[PDB]
Write a protein that binds this DNA or RNA. Structure first.
Lengths: 129, 129, 129, 129, 129, 129
RNA sequence: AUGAGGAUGACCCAU
RNA sequence: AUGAGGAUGACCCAU
RNA sequence: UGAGGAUGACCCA
RNA sequence: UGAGGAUGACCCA
């Protein structure tokens, strides 16, 4: 089941959706980027490895561009001022079955669901209170 | 207001749903745990820090346990066979507006949506190909 | 949600009630103080820590002041003639479920219920006999 | 007259109530134990001493056991899987009158009354937040 | 009386008012920010501590954005050129009663009232003369 | 003009109003005191300095006294039981226009307005919760 | 320069 | 600060 | 650990 | 004294 296909990263109900597509596969690290310059693109990378004898580990990185007052195709410096970096590390014991793993995916989905604490804090430039 | 509220971490259609509640805010680290013995509980922690002069960093951690009943010293104890750990760090520039942050939240949601590449690989115990 | 709120420490019918309110939550130590002169105020502090691999430990402290006025050089100040110090430590293994914890709390409330041995000895400047 | 009597430590309606009864009063230390196996019993001890010239100090201790059966070599014994330990010290100046003492007792009962911050945190395996 | 609620920081008679709302409570330090990027937001933080045996101390910090020629949602450097920092430290002796403290609040209100020397000097980019 | 004028520091409706007047400008520090013995007077000081190449810093200090009559050496002297100290530093960039500065003054006024969070906490001898 | 550093208060301390 | 560094998990390691 | 003291988030064996 | 540990009337600084 080849899963290295393009998908919708940011969904705005069909209109203004951000699609990210396969762009690199060097070293088993899969990469997806949006149709932009690499300085203003949405980037996603993913890889898996046996971190130790007892665990496997997925490393997922996401890069999101600052859009407000952005100049499409322009040179915007400093780079650090225009990009956000998401860095995810998922450690799963080798005993985890397919079912166990489905549960783990759901926990991640639940964590970021709309209206829940964490995503609400992030979207409002806040912390917890 | 107050975003420090309980929420559903694992959704199984209102039955066997893993719901998590606020349990501690000591040292600026917001904590949530499920109704279980501290040894078998799901745990979620969050904290925001001004990592740099121009950055803010969210550090989020989730612990998914595999519940079991061990028999140490010929006695039964509620324990965890093993634990899966999710570790994410999100660095956001201070110049990001609320709408810029909403864009990051949506990207994270789209990333883990059912059927998309990454959650599919994780749930099937495989890599991206 | 939040339990770091104001509450009635001493209940005297509805009036003369001593209420203690949040004042500080620095370094994992929550603190409650009663209104007016800090010098004549009631104080309550609380904290929890993983005392060891299997134990979590609560450290609770209460201070009951003896309100008085100090005159010196014809200058009077609101002070506490003296203070009574309550100091308790509660150790709970990580295997304790919410039910086990509820039982522990009932034990503490029973220990101090009116008419029982200990609260009666204390209330009468006495010991056991 | 005597306050070294039996009393209800844990109140569960009228049945399932945990009663603790006198067992020993050696060396100024009063001790109460619940019926049946000493190994699975609840324990409460109390003592008072002149800690200094101006202070008298009460030292109270409670033990809540986790009842369980231990099997070894096919030989089972009634034991406590683990124990929760309550430990409190109350210091009271010799100037405190019976009224002052009654106030101190109300403070302790208020601190642990249902719904209040501390008994709620404990009952839920939580801290303050 | 939960006082950690939103309030109007800059009042322009209903039209164009700047409201600041709860955004963080890490370490007992309360934080309020306006609905902006954190680089252009109005920020307010407050905390209290026992500075010494004789005093308590409120530390209040306010950050005000430079608005003239501002680009909403834009990246404006250097940060020091676009922000003003207010740093307040209020030391109150433990003997101060609620009344004493009300007087202290009034002194602060009087200090900054319209038409008075200090606020007039500040609003006109002047000193005293 | 000349903004160095007397003003009402504490307003109690034209009766018992603490009014403060110009008393010294030595060393670039504007001083105001109330009509009292220098030992029992309210004191307000202000000074502006070009703290940096691109900053100006206002340093404001207010002293609220608790008046009393001490009897040193068997003689009566007008003195202060204790003093409360307000210490504020305001750093404003040189690029701030007059309208930018008016915005800072309004923020400080809104901050201390009756009924708002901070002045409420201070007047009640509590923290923010 | 920075400190939710301290003060008796136009001073002191740490970096 | 950086690591498709590790973990028993608000900790540890390398640079 | 302490039926160790305390001017109580400190101190002693 | 200790928001020091405990197999809780013991033990550590």
């Amino acid at each position: 089941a080849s899963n290295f296909t393009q998908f919708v990263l940011v969904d705005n109900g069909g209109t203004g959706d951000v699609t990210v597509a396969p762009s690199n596969f060097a070293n088993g690290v899969a990469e997806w980027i949006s149709s932009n310059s690499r300085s203003q693109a949405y980037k996603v990378t993913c890889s898996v490895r046996q971190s130790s004898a007892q665990n496997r580990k997925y490393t997922i990185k996401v890069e999101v561009p600052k859009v407000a007052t952005q100049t499409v195709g322009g040179v915007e410096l400093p780079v650090a001022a225009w990009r956000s970096y998401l860095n995810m590390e998922l450690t799963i014991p080798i005993f985890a079955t397919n079912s166990d793993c489905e549960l783990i995916v759901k926990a991640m989905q639940g964590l970021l669901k709309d209206g829940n604490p964490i995503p609400s804090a992030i979207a409002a430039n806040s912390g917890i209170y």
